[PDB]
């Protein structure tokens, strides 16, 4: 067996710029061996939750496709990335299905994403006509229609810009602080599995 191409997990955790929540990346990691033990065996990860599989058993049962997605979100709602949980960002910007199958990892990054004056770069949605289907982007800069008066493009008290900024400050409360979140979803399509474990 020896070893072969190892999955570029670093290039999704150790990158430099993370996309805002409203428009998240989707790396199609495939045909590589991923060693999740090194990921789990580390104290740098604040929250390490999994569903459908225990975190200390996924190193076997070669999978078909693994989707890695990233956000930077306020710490005090990280929990609501879990299936079913309702709230504000989850119900408009990212909602996992109740039959979700994957792992949610999150760690604090106060040393990088925050700035002395406050890095207000990341944005999140605030309004929408209805809820969001699972696993779909919502890139749209069209003013949301509140009430019933039409919105021709001019911002108004019922014509709200969908996005707004976190407004990070590296002195706020622990909850207000940023957190880098990585969602590793797994899918078993009927086809030869292509992402196995280290020893195999």
């Amino acid at each position, epitope marked *: 067996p020896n070893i072969t191409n190892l999955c570029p997990f670093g290039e999704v955790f150790n990158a430099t710029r993370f996309a805002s929540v409203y428009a998240w990346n989707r790396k199609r990691i495939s045909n590589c061996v991923a060693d999740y033990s090194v990921l789990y065996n580390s104290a740098s990860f604040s929250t390490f939750k999994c569903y459908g599989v225990s975190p200390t058993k996924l190193n076997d049962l070669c999978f078909t496709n693994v989707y890695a997605d990233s956000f930077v979100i306020r710490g005090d709602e990280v929990r609501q990335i879990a299936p079913g949980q309702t709230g504000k960002i989850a119900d408009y910007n990212y909602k996992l299905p109740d039959d979700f199958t994957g792992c949610v990892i999150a760690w604090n990054s106060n040393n990088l994403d925050s700035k002395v*004056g406050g890095n207000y770069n990341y944005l999140y949605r605030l309004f929408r006509k209805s809820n969001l289907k699972p696993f779909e982007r919502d890139i749209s800069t069209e003013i949301y229609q509140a*009430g019933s008066t039409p919105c021709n493009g001019v911002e108004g*008290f019922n014509c709200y*810009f969908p996005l707004q900024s976190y407004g990070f400050q590296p002195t706020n409360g622990v909850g207000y602080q940023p957190y880098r979140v990585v969602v590793l979803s797994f899918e078993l399509l009927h086809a030869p599995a292509t992402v196995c474990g280290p020893k195999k």
Partner: antibody, heavy 120, light 107 residues
């Protein structure tokens, strides 16, 4: 705790733009909206400018367009105002208002002390 | 564009009278209409927002009422000391927040 103050420049130069700064405190700033109005001697009050802290669309009335600019300012909680083509009847008090609960269909937020922007 | 008008434009009363300020707008704003105070020497502040929905720090005598597009601002305990100028302020889903002509209530 919720209130705001302004600077006090008087005359930059006739026929040239002026700078007015407003700061506020007591309420979360990157959720609300701010706006600018003119008060001329004679107790006549008219609206001039309005900018939301969210994204930024400097929308103004038809009369005063291409002649004014309001810039978003997250220093701590601020905004800067400018307007060109100074004339003989631009002397006035430039009042700042802020709707804190912009995302709610409600109006609130105290007003600044007024900037006496005169011409000479 | 939206426009409105404030008809009283002047009051002359001393005590007790339920003094009313009636202003009417070109459009029947649902409820996004408020009123502003202005002392002859201070900066304007807020008295009632959202069509007579009072705000923290308001006095008791200040109130208001609505009837279709017509809107009334009422003082049921008019006193000789609460002398200033008033304005009824409009805003409904469009940027132009044109101002009314105001009113200087006087004894």
């Amino acid at each position: 705790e919720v209130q705001l103050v302004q600077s006090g420049p008087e005359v930059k130069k006739p026929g040239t733009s002026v700078k007015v700064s407003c700061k506020a405190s007591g309420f979360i700033f990157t959720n609300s909206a701010v706006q600018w109005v003119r008060q001329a001697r004679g107790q006549r009050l008219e609206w001039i400018g309005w900018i939301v802290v969210g994204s930024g669309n400097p929308n103004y009335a038809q009369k005063f367009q291409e002649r004014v600019t309001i810039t978003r300012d997250r220093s701590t909680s601020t905004a800067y105002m400018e307007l060109s083509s100074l004339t003989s009847e631009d002397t006035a008090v430039y009042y700042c208002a802020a709707f804190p609960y912009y995302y709610d269909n409600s109006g609130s937020g105290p007003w600044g002390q007024g900037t006496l922007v005169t011409v000479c | 564009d939206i426009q409105l008008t404030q008809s009283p434009s002047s009051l002359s009363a001393s005590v007790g009278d339920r003094v009313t300020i009636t202003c009417q707008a070109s459009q029947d704003i649902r409820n996004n209409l408020n009123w502003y105070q202005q002392i002859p020497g201070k900066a304007p502040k807020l008295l009632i927002y959202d069509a007579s929905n009072l705000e923290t720090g308001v006095p008791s005598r200040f109130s208001g009422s609505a009837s279709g597009t017509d809107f009334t601002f009422t003082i049921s305990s008019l006193q000789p000391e609460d002398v200033a100028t008033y304005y009824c302020q409009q805003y409904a889903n469009l940027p132009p927040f044109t101002f009314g002509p105001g009113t200087k209530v006087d004894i």
